[PDB]
Design a binder for this molecule. Structure first.
Ligand SMILES: *[C@@H]1O[C@H](CO)[C@@H](O[C@@H]2O[C@H](CO)[C@@H](O[C@@H]3O[C@H](CO)[C@@H](O)[C@H](O)[C@@H]3O)[C@H](O)[C@H]2NC(C)=O)[C@H](O)[C@H]1NC(C)=O
Ligand SMILES: *[C@@H]1O[C@H](CO)[C@@H](O[C@@H]2O[C@H](CO)[C@@H](O)[C@H](O)[C@H]2NC(C)=O)[C@H](O)[C@H]1NC(C)=O
Ligand SMILES: Cc1cccc(NC(=O)c2ccc(C(F)(F)F)cc2C(=O)O)n1
Length: 653
């Protein structure tokens, strides 16, 4: 344990609040950053709606149900909370069966005063704030009109009809799909993709034969129907639709799907579903254009039914992602990549962990991670893997140790180096959060039955101390805490036993970490270190990062203003910083990219109908987000591969 005098500190700081009876649908929303404002919304269906508010981080709520006029709020649309600190809150309310249109309750300041506005239409969707201006909203109506508002929902105007899907781009741009006749389901693949810069003053048709579309990073993606067929394929656009490239990705049937797994201004992770009811697909990573794709992972478990994947950005160390794959035998293994998908491997098992029945060898086994897929199978998993960018290196997850994901009741495992190494944090399932950029870690035992106790650790999970926060135990469902993992306030939620009420105990760790952190506590940490002795040690994507990192031994507060300190070393370029361009491959182990003897499959499709500027390749492209400098420069004098597809074909004219 190692902490002296904790019960004293936490006694004062434990704050209980009580709420009304089960069972009602419960919504909790944080409003703003550095505000402490929380909205709890409760709705009841029997032959109404309650709304509370707290400015103290959840220590004391007081009941503002007065401010909505006592009317009935609909949990379908929930609470549409404005971006950043704009403080916008919008609630959609239920109206009499035959009404003009719907009604919403608008707060422009952190839910202190609400104004009720009657809409000219009926909302089919939660209203969506424009990213650049929180005063801009768009909604889809039940008649499929696209409605827009410049004034934050006071006045609306219908800027197009027959709209399937509509999204805010950057700079108040709206992208939406329309349909000619029939219904969005009927005309699917026949959809038309539009853009409007001026909020409906003027439009442009950027797409046709559209199955679907989506945004990630700088890319606009659209899947387009074959003129000849039911197959579709991805086209990509960097200009917001003005020009369109066919991706080098396989086409799919109507059985299959694309999923954008992750996107950043450098690249995307694209999941392509496998033909047949596989339950798996292939992961591709793109180049910085989104045009050129590299096969990253085989048999990536993503289910056709319910849409579960285990795919996880480990957001506490750059380059690092974990995911599940379906082996040849039907068993699920976890895989981790440290280099942004350039290579996948098995997570290393804890030093002292021993293998389970899954493992065919008893001293030699991996760690496997419970994530969305596990949870969906009703395995005993209260939480998915957790990591925060402020807390460098830290990953917390339920797992098992063996050759595959085990159905047994999992322990909880922690990593401080971003997933290179692991130890058992806690035996048994737990709920966990991170406070104060890793200054504190907090855990609740997951029990079939009531708990009066919360666990906390100030050394990043190496040591734990038990605190009893209530002497009347609760049935415990969840933790609420301020997003961004910067506060010292945690809210334990649950209900009492039997004739009941929901309760929340919010604990301030304010005095548990009494003294502030200062330079002395931090220590120099090279990320991604494999071999100390090496010049190139810790180069990922062409460079190293050295971090200043809070000493495990130091017990103190990083503070709300804490800034991860790190400095880059820029590594010399090797071939391993380059990906094969179109029509090139690595045949041997050797990194070197050589010309393919000929194009096959979707390589041949791309070559046949492909956009011509990309056809000449350098054989080599710098991995996106790779910052390496100097060293090797294999990128080549451009060479036209157009003729080498068509050299086989007889040509006309
Ligand atoms: C996996 O998760 C990591 C950690 O969150 C992602 O890295 C983050 O990427 C975002 C977007 O590229 C970076 O955003 C920042 O946005 C501000 C403007 O709001 C801009 O001024 C900054 O220059 C920066 O772009 C964010 O800094 C970055 N976080 C860290 C710690 O590097 C990563 O993108 C995720 N991977 C994928 C493929 O999405
Ligand atoms: C934990 O919650 C308390 C509220 O109970 C937060 O206190 C606020 O602190 C800021 C700056 O320290 C003040 O400007 C606010 O006026 C305080 N509000 C109240 C109601 O006291 C405290 O910041 C939270 N702790 C952390 C680490 O975020
Ligand atoms: C889990 C699941 C189930 C069913 C469908 C999907 N994905 C898509 O429909 C999709 C989304 C985005 C894009 C685009 F934006 F990349 F183009 C293309 C498609 C596509 O399949 O055609 N995902």
């Amino acid at each position: 344990g190692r902490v002296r005098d904790f019960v004293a500190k936490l006694a004062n700081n434990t704050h209980q609040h009580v709420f009304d009876d089960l069972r009602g649908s419960v919504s909790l929303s944080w409003v703003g950053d550095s505000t402490g404002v929380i909205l709890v919304l409760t709705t009841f269906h029997v032959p109404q709606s309650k709304l509370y508010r707290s400015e103290d981080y959840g220590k004391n709520f007081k009941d503002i149900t007065d401010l909505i006029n006592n009317t009935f709020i609909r949990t379908e649309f929930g609470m549409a909370i404005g971006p950043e600190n704009s403080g916008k809150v919008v609630l959609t309310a239920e109206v009499s069966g035959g009404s003009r249109g719907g009604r919403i309750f608008r707060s422009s300041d952190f839910a202190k005063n609400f104004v009720q506005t009657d809409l000219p239409f009926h909302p089919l969707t939660q209203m969506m704030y424009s990213p650049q201006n929180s005063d801009y909203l768009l909604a889809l109506s039940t008649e499929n009109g696209l409605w827009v508002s410049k004034n934050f929902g006071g006045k609306w105007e219908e800027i197009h009809k027959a709209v399937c899907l509509a999204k805010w781009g950057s700079d108040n741009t709206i992208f939406f799909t329309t349909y000619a006749n029939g219904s969005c389901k009927a005309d699917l693949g026949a959809l038309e993709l539009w853009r409007t810069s001026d909020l409906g003053k003027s439009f442009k048709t950027i797409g046709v034969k559209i199955y679907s579309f989506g945004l990630g990073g700088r890319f606009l993606f659209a899947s387009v129907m074959a003129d000849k067929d039911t197959t579709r394929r991805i086209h990509v656009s960097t200009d917001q639709g003005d020009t369109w490239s066919m991706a080098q990705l396989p086409s799919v049937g109507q059985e299959q799907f694309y999923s954008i797994l992750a996107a950043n201004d450098d690249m995307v992770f694209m999941h392509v579903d496998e033909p047949g009811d596989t339950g798996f697909g292939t992961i591709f990573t793109s180049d910085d254009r989104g045009i050129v794709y590299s096969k990253s992972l085989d048999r990536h478990l993503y289910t056709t039914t319910g849409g579960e994947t285990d795919f996880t950005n480990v957001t506490s160390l750059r380059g690092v992602y974990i995911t599940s794959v379906l082996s040849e035998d039907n068993s699920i293994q976890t895989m981790i990549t440290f280099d942004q998908g350039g290579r996948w491997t098995h997570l290393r098992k804890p030093e002292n962990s021993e293998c389970d029945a899954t493992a065919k060898n008893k001293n030699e086994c991996s760690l496997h991670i419970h994530a969305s897929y596990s949870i969906s199978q009703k395995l005993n998993v209260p939480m998915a893997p957790l990591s925060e960018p402020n807390a460098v290196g830290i990953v917390i997850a339920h797992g098992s140790v063996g050759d595959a994901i085990s159905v047994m009741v999992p322990d909880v495992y922690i990593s401080d180096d971003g997933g290179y190494s692991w130890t058992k944090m806690l035996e048994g399932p737990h709920y966990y959060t991170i406070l104060d950029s890793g200054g504190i870690i907090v855990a609740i035992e997951h029990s079939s039955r009531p708990i009066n106790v919360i666990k906390f650790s100030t050394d990043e999970g190496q040591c734990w101390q038990t605190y009893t926060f209530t002497r009347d135990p609760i049935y415990f469902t969840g933790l609420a805490s301020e997003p961004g993992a910067r506060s010292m306030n945690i809210s334990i939620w649950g209900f009492t036993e039997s004739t009941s009420q929901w309760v929340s105990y919010t604990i301030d760790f304010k005095d548990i970490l009494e003294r502030n952190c200062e330079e002395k506590d931090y220590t120099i940490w090279l990320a991604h270190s494999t071999d100390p002795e090496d010049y190139e040690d810790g180069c990922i994507l062409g460079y190293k990062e050295q971090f200043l990192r809070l000493r495990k031994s130091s017990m103190c507060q990083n503070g709300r203003d804490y800034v991860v300190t790190k400095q880059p070393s820029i590594c010399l370029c090797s071939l391993e910083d380059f990906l094969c361009d179109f029509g090139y491959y690595r045949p041997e182990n050797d990194s070197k990219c050589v010309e393919q003897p000929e194009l096959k499959g979707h390589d041949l499709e791309f070559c046949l109908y492909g956009r011509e500027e990309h056809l000449t390749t350098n054989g080599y492209r710098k991995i996106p987000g790779d910052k390496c400098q100097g060293g090797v420069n294999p990128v080549r004098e451009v060479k036209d591969l157009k003729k080498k597809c068509t050299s086989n074909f007889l040509s006309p004219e």
